[PDB]
């Protein structure tokens, strides 16, 4: 790209527990915990009872040192900057006897001029990480109250005083690992003349005919002379130049602001997953001085995203309009992929997005108790067509709002807004998670004096209704901001449900049946969820076999909600026979979470346009644990992920049965209307025999982006109560010429009420390496089958599906670990779980 040289400061690091004077190799980027693990100085934090055994680390200070060589020639570059992309958290950075920086914000990158401090030959970098605990003890002691951050698993809730990942202090699905270290990359850049400080591609307008852009550059010129330069912007697509623009300047010492207009005629639009291609242009900005001294590029998607949040007859709408078209949101809430962030590899990020794209998602919420994710994450969003709802990193508690804290947050907000604002995927900012809800409804007013309660309320506005929205207005002015999710709606207050987004925790915390999701509807569901134990191979990764009960102390260990086990059983008993064995119980819990949650995903799509989106809680896990996730820590899809994929299908046949009657809806998120369609249904018993005749509804239309009822029949006089216990409804949708475009299966009774016949799923297996093709067969219905393998991270073409009486079913299992010579397979189904 340009004449600069970058040195990656990523080898030869050592670390030491302060005071010990003992030093050992470290891996950077990394964490103090991981460095210790690598030297068997801590046990596997995720195993067994090890949480309590690793806590001591957070009471210690930790130092990091590296040496590097700089040549005479490098020292004669005009400028040299040391960039820290992340320091967790209170870090005194020393280079060659100079204190360059007192870092105090995990979420901030720092760029430091170092030429004048560097020496020819060897150079010594030394970082002192103050314990974030010991650092904030005195701050907590000055405060005279304890903030109500219940997810902070310590008597003193110190999390709130630090700009550090909230979940690192513990969460209701997470381990407490209050770590430190150089958590993103360290780079030393040697350069001439200037660097591009920021390159913002600002979209001014977009029509089918023309995209107008403003290319906004901040150049930091490091020499004392005035430098004539030419600024060049090349717009390209797939390696071919689309437009090129050019601007003569004379760069002054310090910051220069340069703006160059560019246009793209007949622009190829970036579209979300399901609606077309996630087209990305390449925008390259160069500073040319006679040599290209500086260059920076962004991949740019050309699209409009408008969040429509307006008063209406139903209350206040909350929806996303994309490229002019109201887009029903289908997705999940995302949390950190690990307790130790630098352990999340490029491959792990790629697989997560594959999992989202494959489940037909078009949106993800990066929830406020994690981090502002790394550049890769948003790059993957961009190229997978997934819209991104970005919370600022505040969750579930009120926070300080003193001048100095607000200054720190302002830096963090400016840094990440500029970092993220060029991404096609970025759709909106949200000030926090559930803080206004908490302040209003979680009983804080009986916990604090009236004066401190008032200070919390005034402090709320300072941060979330003044500082954050005004910063977004300044630096990202065409992006929506909302102060909180949920902004008004509260799950115990039906009158508030028509106003904006909902976290419906009536299911789970309120003990409400899954069927309540058909009647308790939001304008937009930004959270709802249900826990499940992960499958046995994940349990085995943290527990010995003597530990495989629900309430072993092990298992308790890996259940951070406190309530969760009894809720699971309470809900399971409503719909299923509770199995006697721990492993059968784990299996039925996976089925339960998949079935109840997908009934909600279905209600929300069915009730469009009243409801315009659904993001379940939660996509993923940070470690081996019992949680609300659809994918466990090892990347195994639970039933819920397969069920999310089905419920998010572009076209879906949705049968819904209430008050002894059946409706069938056809739901489409396609951009085109389907015409001359036939819905075909037939009642089949568990032995495979059709009851009565096929039912045909011909001449159906399925308009773009609609949910519509095409069929209703009462059960009474159609099927007897015994038929209902003994048969299912198969439903297929076909075009004019009889091509199948969709299919569903419907059961008339709760699973515990079904007269399931004893049966064996037999299978044939054809195994090559990387691969296992299974052909399954059962003469009778096998209900909710789980094809279970011991192979961590094995991917399946399908799983957690009903194998229909007599119907062959092909399933492909893939894994890099499958060898050309036989994969262990155990097939479970509902009837086996009880006598
Ligand atoms: O309890 C599970 C999850 C939390 O992990 C997370 O804070 C989320 O915002 C939420 N709201 C209600 C419950 N939940
Ligand atoms: Br410099
Ligand atoms: Br600099
Ligand atoms: Br200027
Ligand atoms: Br990174
Ligand atoms: Br108080
Ligand atoms: Br606001
Ligand atoms: Br137990
Ligand atoms: Br019913
Ligand atoms: Br069902
Ligand atoms: Cl261990
Ligand atoms: Cl940046
Ligand atoms: Cl139903
Ligand atoms: Cl059986």
Description:
It is a single chain. This protein folds into five domains: 1-192, Sandwich (Jelly Rolls), CATH 2.60.120; 193-301, Immunoglobulin-like (Sandwich); 302-648, Glycosidases (TIM Barrel); 649-750, Immunoglobulin-like; 751-835, Immunoglobulins (Immunoglobulin-like, Sandwich). The strands form 13 sheets. It has a six-stranded antiparallel sheet. Strands 29-28-27-26-25-32 form a six-stranded parallel sheet, with helices on one face. With 835 residues, the chain is an alpha+beta fold. It contains 14 helices and 46 strands. It is 19% helix and 34% strand. Strand 15 (227-237) and strand 16 form a beta hairpin. The radius of gyration is 29 Å and the shape is globular. The chain binds the ligand OC[C@@H]1[C@@H](O)[C@H](O)[C@H](O)c2nccn21, bromide ion (9 copies) and chloride ion (CL) (4 copies). One bromide ion (BR) is lined by residues 657-660. The PDB classes it as hydrolase. The entry lists the keywords linear free energy relationship, transition state mimic, mannosidase, glycoside hydrolase, hydrolase. The assembly is monomeric.
């Amino acid at each position: 790209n340009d004449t600069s040289e970058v040195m990656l400061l990523d080898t030869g690091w050592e670390f030491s527990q302060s005071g010990t004077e003992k030093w050992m190799p470290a891996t950077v980027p990394g964490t103090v915990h991981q460095d210790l693990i690598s030297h068997e100085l801590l046990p596997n934090p995720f195993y067994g009872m090890n949480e309590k055994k690793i806590q001591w680390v957070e009471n210690e200070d930790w130092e990091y040192r590296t040496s590097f060589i700089v040549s005479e020639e490098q020292l004669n570059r005009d400028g040299i900057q040391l960039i820290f992309e992340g320091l967790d958290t209170y870090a005194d950075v020393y280079l060659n006897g100079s204190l360059l920086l007192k870092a105090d914000n995990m979420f901030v990158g720092y760029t430091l001029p170092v030429k004048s401090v560097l020496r020819k030959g060897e150079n010594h970098l030394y970082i002192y990480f103050h314990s974030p605990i010991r650092q904030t003890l005195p701050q907590y002691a000055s405060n005279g109250f304890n903030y109500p951050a219940d997810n902070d698993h310590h008597e003193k809730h110190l999390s709130v005083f630090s700009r550090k990942a909230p979940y690192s202090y513990g969460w209701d699905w997470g381990i407490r690992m209050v770590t430190s270290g150089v958590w993103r990359p360290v780079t030393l850049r040697f350069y001439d003349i200037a660097t591009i400080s920021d390159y913002y591609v600002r979209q001014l307008s977009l029509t089918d005919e023309n995209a107008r852009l403003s290319n906004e550059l901040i150049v930091n010129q490091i020499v004392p002379q005035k430098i004539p330069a030419e600024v060049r912007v090349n717009v390209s697509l797939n390696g071919t130049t689309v437009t090129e623009v050019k601007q003569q300047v004379t760069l002054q010492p310090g910051i220069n602001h340069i703006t160059l207009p560019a246009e793209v005629t007949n622009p190829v639009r970036w579209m979300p997953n399901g609606w077309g291609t996630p087209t990305l242009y390449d925008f390259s900005a160069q500073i040319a001085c006679g040599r290209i001294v500086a260059e920076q590029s962004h991949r740019i998607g050309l699209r409009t995203i408008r969040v429509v949040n307006e008063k209406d007859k139903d209350g206040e709408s909350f929806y996303f309009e994309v490229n002019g078209i109201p887009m029903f949101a289908k997705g999940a809430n995302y949390i950190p992929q690990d307790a130790l962030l630098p352990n999340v590899t490029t491959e792990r990020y790629q697989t997560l997005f594959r999992d989202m794209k494959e489940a037909n998602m078009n949106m993800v919420r990066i929830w406020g108790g994690g981090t502002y994710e790394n550049n890769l994450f948003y790059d993957l969003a961009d190229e997978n067509g997934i819209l991104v709802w970005q919370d600022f990193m505040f969750a579930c508690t009120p926070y300080p709002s003193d001048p100095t804290f607000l200054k720190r947050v302002e830096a963090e907000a400016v840094y990440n807004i500029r970092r993220l604002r060029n991404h096609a995927s970025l759709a909106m900012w949200c000030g926090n998670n559930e803080i206004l809800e908490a302040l209003k409804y979680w009983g804080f007013e009986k916990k604090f004096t009236p004066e401190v309660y008032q200070g919390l309320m005034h402090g709320y506005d300072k941060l979330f209704r003044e500082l954050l929205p005004s910063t977004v207005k300044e630096f990202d002015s065409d992006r929506f901001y909302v102060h909180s999710s949920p902004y008004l709606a509260n799950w115990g207050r039906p009158e508030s449900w028509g106003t904006g987004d909902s976290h419906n925790w009536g299911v789970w915390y309120g003990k409400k049946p899954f069927e309540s999701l058909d009647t308790d509807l939001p304008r937009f569901m930004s959270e709802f969820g249900f826990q499940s134990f992960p499958e046995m191979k994940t349990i085995a990764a943290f527990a010995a076999p003597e530990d495989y009960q629900i309430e072993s102390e092990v298992m308790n260990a890996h259940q951070k909600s406190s309530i969760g086990n009894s809720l699971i059983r309470t809900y399971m008993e409503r719909d299923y026979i509770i199995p006697e064995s721990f492993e059968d119980f784990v299996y039925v819990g996976l089925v339960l979470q998949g079935q109840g949650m997908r009934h909600g995903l279905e209600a929300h799509r069915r009730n469009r346009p009243y409801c315009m989106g659904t993001l379940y809680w939660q996509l993923n896990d940070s470690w081996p644990v019992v949680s609300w996730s659809s994918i466990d820590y090892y990347g195994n899809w639970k039933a819920l992920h397969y069920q999310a994929k089905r419920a998010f299908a572009p076209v879906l046949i949705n049968p819904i049965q209430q008050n002894d009657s059946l409706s069938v809806y056809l739901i489409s998120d396609r951009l085109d209307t389907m015409e001359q369609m036939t819905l075909e249904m037939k009642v089949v018993d568990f032995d495979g025999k059709t009851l009565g005749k096929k039912i045909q509804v011909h001449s159906l239309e399925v308009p773009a982006n609609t949910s519509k009822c095409v069929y209703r029949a009462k059960l009474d006089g159609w099927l007897t109560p015994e038929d209902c216990r003994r048969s299912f409804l198969k439903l297929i949708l076909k075009d004019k010429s009889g091509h199948q475009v969709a299919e569903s299966v419907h059961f008339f009774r709760k699973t515990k009420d079904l007269q399931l016949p004893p049966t064996s799923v037999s299978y044939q297996m054809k195994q090559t390496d990387g691969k296992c093709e299974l052909t399954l067969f059962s003469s009778m219905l096998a209900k909710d089958i789980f094809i279970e393998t011991p192979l961590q991270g094995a991917r399946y073409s399908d799983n957690f599906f009903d194998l229909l009486p007599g119907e062959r079913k092909k399933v492909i299992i893939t894994s890099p670990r499958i060898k050309k010579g036989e994969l262990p397979v155990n097939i479970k189904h509902i009837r086996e779980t009880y006598k």
